[PDB]
Amino acid sequence: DWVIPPIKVSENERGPFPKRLVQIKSNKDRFNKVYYSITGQGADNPPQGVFRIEWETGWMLVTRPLDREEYDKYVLSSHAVSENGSPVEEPMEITINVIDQNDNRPKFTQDVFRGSVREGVQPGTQVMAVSATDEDDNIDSLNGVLSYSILKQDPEEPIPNLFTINRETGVISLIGTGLDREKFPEYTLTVQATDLEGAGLSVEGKAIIQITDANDNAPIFDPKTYTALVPENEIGFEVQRLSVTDLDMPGTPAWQAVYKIRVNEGGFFNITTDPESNQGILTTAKGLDFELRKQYVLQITVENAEPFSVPLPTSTATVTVTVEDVNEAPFFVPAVSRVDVSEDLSRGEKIISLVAQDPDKQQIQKLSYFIGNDPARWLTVNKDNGIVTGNGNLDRESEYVKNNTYTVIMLVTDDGVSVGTGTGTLILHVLDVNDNGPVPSPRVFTMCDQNPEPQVLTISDADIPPNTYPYKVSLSHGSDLTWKAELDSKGTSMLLSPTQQLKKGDYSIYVLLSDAQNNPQLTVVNATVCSCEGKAIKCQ
Template sequence: DKRFDVNMDGTVTLKRPLTLHEAYEVFSVHAWDANGKKHTIESPLDHPPSAFSRSLAGLKRAKRGWVIPPFHVPENSRGPFPMKLVQIRSAFAKETEMVYSITGEGADQDPKGIFTVERLSGNLFVTQPLDREKKASYRASIAESPMEILINVIDQNDNKPVFTQYPFNGHVHEATGKGTCIFMTVTATDADDPETYNGIVNYAIVSQEPPFPKSNMFDINILSGTIRVREPDMDREQWPRYTLLIVAADMEGKGSSTTGTAVITITDSNDNPPQFEQTSLSVSVPENKVGAVVAKLTVSDGDEVGSPAWSTKYRIISGDKGGFFNVSTGPSQLEGIITTVKPLDFEKTKQYVLSVIVENDDPCINYFPTSTATVTVNVEYVKEPPKVKVISKPKDSTVDTELVTYTATDDSLFIFLQP
C-alpha cells in the first residue's frame, strides 16, 4: 500500500492524506528476521482520523487528518536530552500553519515534563532517561484532538535475577528413588519484562557439597526451579545434609546472573534394623513370683535417635504357651524387659526356652532378617515354710478316738494337738 511508509523501528506513517470510507481499514506489515523468515501482522485503523486547518478565524477541526501509531522508546537512553522521538504532522500542514501541543501522562500530568512538543514543528521530545520498571508506557494526546499518542518503553536487560529466599531449605527421605519426587522449589524474580528473555530466569546447579556418594545427586528444572532426586543411594547416617550452589540467570541462562543456596536435609528411613547385642542367654527365676524381672535384652539401631525408625518393640514368638511371661520396651527404647505375669511352678515346669524378636515402630524399607534372642529361663525351687495344722480334741473323747486322717506328701507338715 503506497499510502503508508514503515520505518526501521516499526513505526508506520502516512505518505499522503488518507480518507477512510468505512469504520476501519486493515493493512499488513511484513518483517524478515536474521534467518530470512517472514513475519506478518495485520494492523487495523479502527477510528476515522481527524485533521486540523488554520484559517483566519483560528484552529478548526477538519474531516480528514493524521494517524499517529504507537511508537517505542528504549529505556536508559544516554541522550543527549532533550532527545527527539518523532515529528507529529497534520495532513494539512502544507496547506496551513499548524500549532501543536500534547496533554496526558508525562506531559502536563504526573509524571510531568517527561515529554514536550515544539509548537510549530510538531517535534516530540523526551527530556530524560526512561525506566520501564517504573512505568512501561505513557498515554498522551494532541491537545486539540482526541487522537491518542501511545509511547511504549522498550525493556533493556538492566536488572539481574534476585532469589526470593536465602537459603532455601528442603527435606527428602534417604530412600527416595531416582526422579520420583519433586521435594522443593527455588525461585528468583527479575524486574525486567517477563515477556522477553530479559525477564525470563533459568536455573542451574553449580556445585554440591558433599560430593558423595556422587557429585550429581540432584537435578533442577531449568525453567521452574523444582529440585528432585537424580541419583539413589542417599545415606543419612553418612551424609545427613547437602548444600547446593544454584545460579539463576536471564537471557536463557547467558545474561545477568546471581547465586543462591539450597540446603537439603536427608530425613531418616528405616534402613538399619535393630540388632540384639546378646542373642543367647540363660537366667534363673524363683518360682511363685509375679512381676519378677527375668531378663533385660539390649539392642542397637543405627537410625536417627528418637525417630520411629529407631525406637523398638518386642514379641515372644515361642516357648510361652501358658502365657507366663511378658516383654515390654524399656525407658531407653533400646531395651526389651521380660517379666513374669503368672507364678512359675518348679514342680510343673523347671525350664522355659523363650524366643524373642525385636522390631522398629516403622517397618524397614527393605527386607532384613529379624534379630532374634533365645532366653533360657530356669525355674528355681523355693522351699516353702512348714504347714501347721491344729486339731482340737473333744472333752468327752477317749484315748483311742480317731480325730482325723492325713496322708503326708512331704516332710513340711506338722500336726499339733490342742486339748
C-alpha cells in the same frame, strides 16, 4: 485522516540531549504566525518536561533518558494558535511507546526454600519446587525468561549428584541413589536463575532438603546370652531385663521392640516391652515348682512394630535360667479310715503304725509327729516314729460316737532345716462288745385298788445286735409279795401283775433280766398304789 504513527523510543537512551523526534506543521499558516505548543502527562502534566516543542519550528524532542519499567508509554496532545490568539487546527493526539532493554536482573521468589524426602525412595522422584522473576519484557524478548540450574549440594558425599532441576519449571527431582537419614540427613544446595534462557544475567538462592526416615535398621541386643536365678513358688515374678539398640528414629514404631520366646515349655513365661530403652522385660507366667527342672534354654527374637523396608537379619537372644529351692511341708499319706478296732483294746497297744512323706529330695530334714484334733484323750503317738497306740478306756457304747464313728485329726512338722505342717484326718472304726444288760422302761407306777390292770413295762439294751436278742425275766427276793412276770408276744415289753389283793401304796418289786444272759440285775421299779377299781389312774 492521514494520522501520525506512534513513536517507538528506546529505554535508557544516552547521547547528547536533546533529541528531535519529529516535526509538525499547520498549513493554515499562510495567514498569521502560528504558535506550537503541546499538552499531557510527560508534557505539562506530571512527569512534567520530558518532552517539549519549539513553538516556532514545530519540532518535538525527548529531553532526557527513560525507563519503560517506570512508564512504558505516553500519549500527548498538540496545538497551534494564531498570533491574534485563535486556534487553527483541532488538536492532535500523539503516542510514544518505550521499547524494553535488559536492565533487570532476576530475583528469587523467597530468600530460601526448604524441602524434604524419605531416604528409601526411588530415582526419578519429585522433591521440591523453586521460583524467581525478571521484570523486563518476556513476551517479545528473552529479557525476562529464566533458566534454572544447580551448582553445589553440600555433603558432597556419598556422591555429589543426588538431584537435578527442570531448567524451564525449576522443579527438582531425585536422580541418584544412596539416601540415608542415619548418615547424611540434610542437604544444602545452591541454585541459580538466568536471563535469556540461561544466557543473560544470573543470581543465587538456597534450597535445603531434610530426609524423612526409613526402617533401614533392625534391632540389636546388648548382651546376646543372659542368665538369672529363680524361686519355685510365691510367684509370677521378674526374672531378667534385656537391652537393645535399633537405629532409626526413637519415638517411632521403627524403634519400638516386640518380642516373643520361640518355645514356651509349659507355657509358663510372659514377656513385655517397655518405652524406656524399650528393654525386654521377662517374667514368670505360672510359678514354677521345682525339683522337676533346673535348666531353661529359651530364645527371644526382636522386631519393630512396623515391617522392614529391606530384608534384614532377625536377631535372637539366648537365655539360661536356674530355679532356687524352697522346701515344703510333709504330708501323711492318706486321710485314714483305718482301724476297725474293738472296745476291749489294752491301754497301750498298736493301732495304726503310720508314715508321712515330704517332697524336697534334699531330704536330710526330719520331722516330728504330733496329734491334734480331739474329743477326749485316749490315743498316743511316738513323735519321732509316728506310732499311734491306744491308751485308755474306750466304749463303743456312748457319747461322742455318733454314727459308728470317732474321727480324729493329727499333725506332723517339717524340721531339720526350716518349717512345716500336715493336716490329716483319721476315722477309726470302733467295734461292739456286749457291755450293758436289759432294763425296764417306766420306773414308777400308779396301780389301782379293787382290780389293777397289767402294768406295762418294757426292755432296752445299749448293745448292738445279736447282743440284745431275746430275754428271760426273773423276780428275786419278792418273787412272791405277789408279782408275776410276762412277755409281750412281739418281744419287747413285759406284763407285770400281782397275785395278792395287796396294800395302800409305796413299795418296790425286784426285777432281773438277761439277753445272751448277762443277767441283769435290775431292780426296783417301785409301785405307788392308791384307792380304786381297775384302770391305772393318776394318783395322789
